[PDB]
Structure formats: C-alpha cells, structure tokens
RNA sequence: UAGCGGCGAGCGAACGGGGAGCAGCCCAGAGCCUGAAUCAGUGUGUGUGUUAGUGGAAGCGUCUGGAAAGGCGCGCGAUACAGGGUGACAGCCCCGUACACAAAAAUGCACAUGCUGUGAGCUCGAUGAGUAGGGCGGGACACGUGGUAUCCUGUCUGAAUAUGGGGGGACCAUCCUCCAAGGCUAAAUACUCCUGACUGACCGAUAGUGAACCAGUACCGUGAGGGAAAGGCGAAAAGAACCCCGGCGAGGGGAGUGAAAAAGAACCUGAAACCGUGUACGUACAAGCAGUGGGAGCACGCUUAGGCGUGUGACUGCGUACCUUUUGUAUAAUGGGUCAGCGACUUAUAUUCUGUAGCAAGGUUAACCGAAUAGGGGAGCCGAAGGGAAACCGAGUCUUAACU
C-alpha cells in the first residue's frame, strides 16, 4: 500500500517553510461576546504547532 | 491398535458434562463450589 | 576475483534479530518491553490517538480551501531560461522544455538567480526584481 | 591512454575516463551482487495456516480436557501445521542507477588493464565452425579461461566457443560486470573496444 | 533455505552434558536438569574462588595462633610483635614454618617478644 | 490529489500525460443495379505443426581397490562438456545431447482455389414514444441528499422530434460539443481442471501435497463430513545349501555367499532419553537444591622414585532448583515426567531518519520497446522559494487605514 493522509488533519495543519506546521487557533468559533477583545485579536493570527505535538502531525500527515 | 489408541484418546475432546471432571472423572466439587459461595 | 570484492565499511548494518537468547540483547520481549497494548502481535494505538483526549486533529478549527487555480499557476526561476532553446519565453516554449507542466496555464518569473542571455518574456507575469534582472541582461519583456 | 595490441604491435587510444580510472570497489560489489540477485528467479512457497489442508473444527473443547488449548489442527506449533511466515514467490530485483552500471564497467576495466588481463586483438576470428580451431588458436595464444569479446558477433566463433567451458563469446553490446570479473582474461576485437567506449561514453 | 537444527543442538546438549559428568541422576544424564546443575556449579565456583582465599588465611591464622601459643604468646601479640620488628613475613610461611621448622619459629616468637616488650 | 466522511474510522476520483493494441460497420428503405468486395459453410491443392520414429562423434595403459568413471601417463571428439545410468567422481561404456532427416493415416493453423449462401456501389428518403424529462421511494456513481450534476428504475405521470434535442457538476443566459430511446464487432486482457519441454540462493520423509508406500485409503461419524501413520539390505538376491539345540516351532550357534551380515529382510547411518552386564572406588551412627572450595585413602597408567594424570571420594567450610509474574518467591504462586524432532518479530508496498555508494543545482526514471540484468523510454516524481484562507505578491509576503 500506500500510506493514506489522515484527512481530517490536512484541513487543519499546514507546512512551513522550514518543516514547521501552523494551525488556527481554538477558541474562535462562538461563545464571543463574554471574551475581551485581547483573547479574540490574540486568536486570530495562525500558530505554529509546538515541540510536543509535531511527532503526531508528521505521523498524521505523511505527504506535508 | 494406533488407529483405536488415536480415536479412544479422541473420546471426551468434545463433551458437556459438568458435575464430571473432564466429562468423566467423578468429584465432589459441586458441593465444593456450592459451599464457597 | 569475485572473491575478493567487498562492500564499504559501514554500509551493510546486521539486522535486529529479537527472541534469540540472553545475550544476544533482543531477547524474551524482543524488546518492548512488558505486557500492555503495545507489546502484543498487531497491538498499538492509531494515529493521532492521545488516549481518548480530544487528539490534536480534531480540538483545532479547520481553515480555509484549495484554490484550484494554484494548481495551474506555476514559478519559474532565472536559473532556467537559459533552457528554453529560443531566447522567447511563452507557456509552450517552456513546456517544450520540460519546465512547467503540460496542465500548467499561468507562469510567473520570480527573481531566483542569475540570468545571463538576452531573453525576451512573452506573455508571462515577471516579478519587479527579476524585470530589472532581466531588463538588465539585455533582455526584453512585453505583454 | 593506448592500448597495446597483441599481434599488430599498434596501440588504440582509449580515454582516460573510461580504461584508466580508479577500482571503487564499493560500487563494483554493489553492482556484482545486484547482478547476482537479478538472476534470482524466486519461486517458493510454503503454506500458511489458511492454506493447509484441514478444517476450522477446533479439536477439544476449550476448557476441562487437562490439554493445552488449541483451536486449529493446521498451527504452526503442531506438526503438520503449516508454516508460520510462509514464503512466496518473490522478486530480488535490484535497482541499479545507470551512472552506478557505467561507473562500476569503467572500474573493472580500468582493472583489467591494470592486472594485464585485457587483450587486444585486432581480429579474432576462426576459419570454419569447428570447436578444435578454436581449441588450437587458444593454444597458440596461451589463453585457457577466456571472454572474447567481438564487435560483430561472427557465427563460426559462436559455435567453436559453445562446447569449451572457460570460455566464452559475447557481443560488444550484452557484456555484464560478473563475466568481467569471472574470466581471468578478456580478449576484445579493436572495434569491440571502439563500441564499448561508445557506450560508457 | 531451511535449515534442520539437528546437529548443533546435538552439540551444545552434548557440551553442557560433558561438563556435568560425576553428578547424581538426572544431573548428569538429562539435559534440562545438566543445565541448571551445571550453572548453579559455575555460581559456586566463583564464589569460591573468593572464600578459598579467606578460608585459607583462617586456616594459617589457626595454626599461628596454635604454635605461637605454644611459645607462650597469643596471635595478636605475636602479630603486633613481629609488625613492631618490622618483619613483613605473610601468614601462609608463618604457617608453613609453624608447622615444618619448630626452630625458626621459636625465633621468630623471641623477635616478636623482643620487640613487643 | 480534488473531494466524500458520526468531516470520525475510513473511502477516494477524474481531467490530463506516457505506453500495450488498434478496425470499423449494419437494420429501421425504395429505386438504379445484381452476384462487385464481405464473411460463413464445405471440397481440393500447397506450406507448416501435432500424433510413431531414424542416424548421431571420439580412449587405452598402469596403481589403490570388492568394484573404477578415481590417482598417475599418453591420446582423440566437440554446431555434441544439457542430463541420466553404469560395482566410487566417465566428453570418448550405455541411453542420450548438438546436428541432419522421417508419415500410410487422422488432424490444428495459414495461403490458394471450386461450389452454395450472403450481400457490394450509386441517387434519394428516413434517422429508434410511454421515450427523454418530471413527482415520490431506493440504488450506482470516490460523492453518505448535501448547494449535488450524471446514470439505473419500483410507483404516478410525460415531451420536442435537425427552423429539434442531450451534456458541459445546483441554476439561468451566451458559446462549444454531441445525436439517446436498435444492434454486431478482432487485438491488447483474466484463468489453469489438463498435456509437453525446461528452470529454481524451493522441500527432502515430524519437511514437501492430507497422500514419495495400492491415500482421500485404514479408521471415526446416522449423515454432511473428518482423516492418519507408514521411504532407504546389497553393486548384484549371490536373500543364508548343509549340520547342531529346539515342540517336524520361535529363537539361536556354526557353515556358506558377500568387500562388509552388530549390511540377514525386526536389514544404510545408528544419537538421546530408558534398561542392563562387567570392572575401580565409595557407601549399612548418619540428616536437607546433592554442588562447590579444601581434601585423606584406594585402584589404574606413567615416571630415570621427580611426589604427575585419570577414576573414586571418607571427612570438612559455604550453599533453600530453573522459568514466569511481581514491591517482593526456596516459596506451600505459574509451568515443565524425560529425550529426540519441530515451534514464535516475517513478507510486500508506501513514508521518515541513520550508514554507505553514484551523480550533483541537479538527481532519477515507471509502464513499455527490447540486440533484451545492456540500451532506449524523462510521462512523471523529488529539489533548487517562500508568504497568504485565497486572488495575488515574490526574497519577500501576510496582518492592518499603516505598521516604531
């Protein structure tokens, strides 16, 4: 065979230019009018995934 | 004599009998198990 | 001297062979280890399995969509059309030179090193650096 | 570089590239054991527990016989079980890359001629399809084990070479790297020489 | 390539099997007991490789403390005295003269009192 | 990959590109015109193949040996040194192999040809209706009804018919493309009950078929069904005349054959567990994982007594098996009566990292063609450029009205 892409993770994660992964921050969906205005613009720029975390995306994502 | 050794070895493979150890051998071991509970 | 040939040193590694004996290292666990899921035959967790926490995949929003029409735009450094055989630069022309792409419909001719030749750029998109590096070159670009 | 002809006492110029380079013995064993591998016709097979010839019916009951459990007369624990990592036919071809062929051919004739087991000749060829004028002109030679090697595949040379054993005779185009290093000389025709420098460029 | 394992198990039965020759029953006739009677000898033998150097050095201080005291003075004085002499005798040739040379050791007990004095 | 997806687990295209192979036609319909290509069915002739076959090279001496093909010495064949047998290992002893030939008869295939049937070609006309589409239900499409195109239809309906209709992924318009509701069609393709030849870093009798042997048998089951074990004397039966013990036995001892009968049919080799006979030593006042460290004596061999070696081992210090599971096992926790044979990290395809080898801003081909592990084949993939959700921009880009 050859390896599927878990899918659900692509629409997710993104590369980088350097092997890095940016996702989209939690958070931003609804409940918004009980958050300041600091958390949702602090939301909103895209993130890079964190040291812990990039073992299990490159394992989801094998062809990005 | 190895054909009736091979299927009289092949006798109680398939048995139900509870109170019967292995199918056959005679116990005590309903009362055993009765008065443990 | 078939019998005297012999690979380099370092390129042939052994092997791990688990479930021989007490000194050989690998042995009665092979290696992973006592019981558990993960040290059974076929056993292990799926990927992106956290225990049953959200996994990472799936606590993160999803964003954005597939252009379809990135697909079809392409990149073409200055490195290359010293390649074209022509010195004039279209969509065939370059796809005659096994650059872009037969699907490809829209190039572009991003500064990336060093053209040399007078070219002349017909009907692409050229960035500004690469105008100037082209345009510096001799070269001509019309559209 | 020249090569030194044996009977006309001229000397071909070769390249240097291509008879005169160094023995990277790394990638000649590379490609001599992925000539090897590639004649390996791998047909084996042995037969799992599906495919052994018995039936599911578990044998005893699973609990209250003294015996061991089991559940298939066909495992791979009990004889006439059924192996447990059964074979099947498989193919151990190697990829060679093109550049490692043509580099590991241009080590193992730069070779020969460094070992002196590469003749020049420039004509070899027998009078009549008989394996005793081959015989004989081998004798004159001082040649017993030997890979001639011809431009033009004569017909009579093919079958005076086709009952001695050590020796063998090939066209310019089908040489291989295990028949270089096998025979202890090689005898190539001048434009078999001229052709094998067409082709390692 | 299957490989049979006959022969090399025949072996390496056979050496473990050698080396448990002289013990009682299954010991020294059945594998899978040779192998732990075997092993279980290898402990020992290196465990007294070690207790044969201090029964040994308890064994010579038995018969110094025996003769010494048969010249009148016990072990530890006479070891004091013959350190205080600055004789640096060990205690195997202490005991070896002990035994053979009743002579030498009764001078050997005249330096020790001479020096412990 | 785009997508589909309790947007979970998973499912997963097409466009387009490279190859293998390549072939188009007929009816709905009249007239002109006929046998005009076309195939089909048969006869005959030719060629080739199958079903029996034929010829097929070239060696002797001597030594070991039961026996020579082996050793040594000297010759010959080879378009034939593929293989098998022959008293040990044979190019030249035998069967064969390379090579060259062979069919009275029956046939397969391919041309040619006779007859029958069949219809070419021209002009003009027609150009598939309960159908397309629709409503409801369901299914197939990668697509789970979703914004869902398209196809199929169980049910209810229902057109236009070349100034027409279908599609182009809801849908409309413009533009492009195609002609449904009739049918036929070789090759590339898939498979091996069965036959022949050849091959194997496949197995060698607990393996390989369940089955090397009168095996789907014996045997088990009412039945469907399940399903064994079991090969090897010798080169050749020359397979033991005859005599003795013995029950006109069984078994044996001689004799004889044989190179060898502890090669005797219970037959090559002949292990281990297990059981004995004989010899040396120890052992009947001594407590326990049975050894180990020390160690007297005795018995055999030596040994220019050198005071060693082997066997035994009185007595003595220390010493509660192995596995497994456990915080922790002599544990009175698990497992194992013993031996012998088998018995568990593999294989394929993707992806990542390390080593190593080639080439290097380039590396590499896949299918396939194939003088065929060569060489062609660069379709493609990966890299040399990122940023952004995307258009777009580009050594920058995004954010933002703009950014210290």
Redesign the pocket.
Known sequence: ????????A??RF?????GGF?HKHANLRHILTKKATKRKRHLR??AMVSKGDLGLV?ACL??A | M???W??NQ?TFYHFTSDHRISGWKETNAMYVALNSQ | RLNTLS???????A??????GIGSGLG???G?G??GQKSRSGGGV???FEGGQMPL??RLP??????????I?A?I?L??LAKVEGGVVDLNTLKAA?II???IE?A?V????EVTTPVTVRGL?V????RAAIEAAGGKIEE | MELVLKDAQSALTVSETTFGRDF?E??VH?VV???????????????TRA?????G?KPWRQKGTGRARSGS?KS??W??????????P????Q?????????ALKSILSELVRQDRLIVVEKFSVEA????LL?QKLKDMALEDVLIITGELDENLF??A????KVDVR?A??I?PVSLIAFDKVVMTADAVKQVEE?LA | ??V???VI??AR?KKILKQA?????????????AF??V???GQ??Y???R??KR?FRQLWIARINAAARQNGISYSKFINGLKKASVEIDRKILADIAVFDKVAFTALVEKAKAALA
């Open positions: 065979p050859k390896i599927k892409t878990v899918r659900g692509a629409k993104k590369k980088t230019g350097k940016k720029p895209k490159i094998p062809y | 190895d054909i009736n091979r299927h092949s | 690979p380099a040193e370092g390129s042939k590694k092997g791990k062979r688990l479930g021989r009665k666990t092979g992973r006592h019981k799926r990927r992106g995949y799936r999803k964003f954005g969509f597939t252009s379809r029409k990135a697909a735009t990149e450094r490195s290359d096994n792409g037969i699907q829209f572009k991003i500064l990336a090193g998109r960035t500004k650096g690469a | 990277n790394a990638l590379q054991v992925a000539y090897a591998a590639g004649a390996r016709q791998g047909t084996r097979a042995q037969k495919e052994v010839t018995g039936s019916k007369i791979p624990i004889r006439s079980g059924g192996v447990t990592f059964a074979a099947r498989q193919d151990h071809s990829k060679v890359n093109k550049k490692m062929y043509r580099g399809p008989k394996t005793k015989a079958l005076a086709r009952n001695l054993h066209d185009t089908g291989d082709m | 390539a299957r049979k394992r006959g198990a025949r039965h020759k002289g013990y009682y029953g299954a010991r020294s006739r059945v594998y899978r007991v732990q009677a092993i279980k000898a020992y033998a465990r007294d490789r207790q044969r029964q």
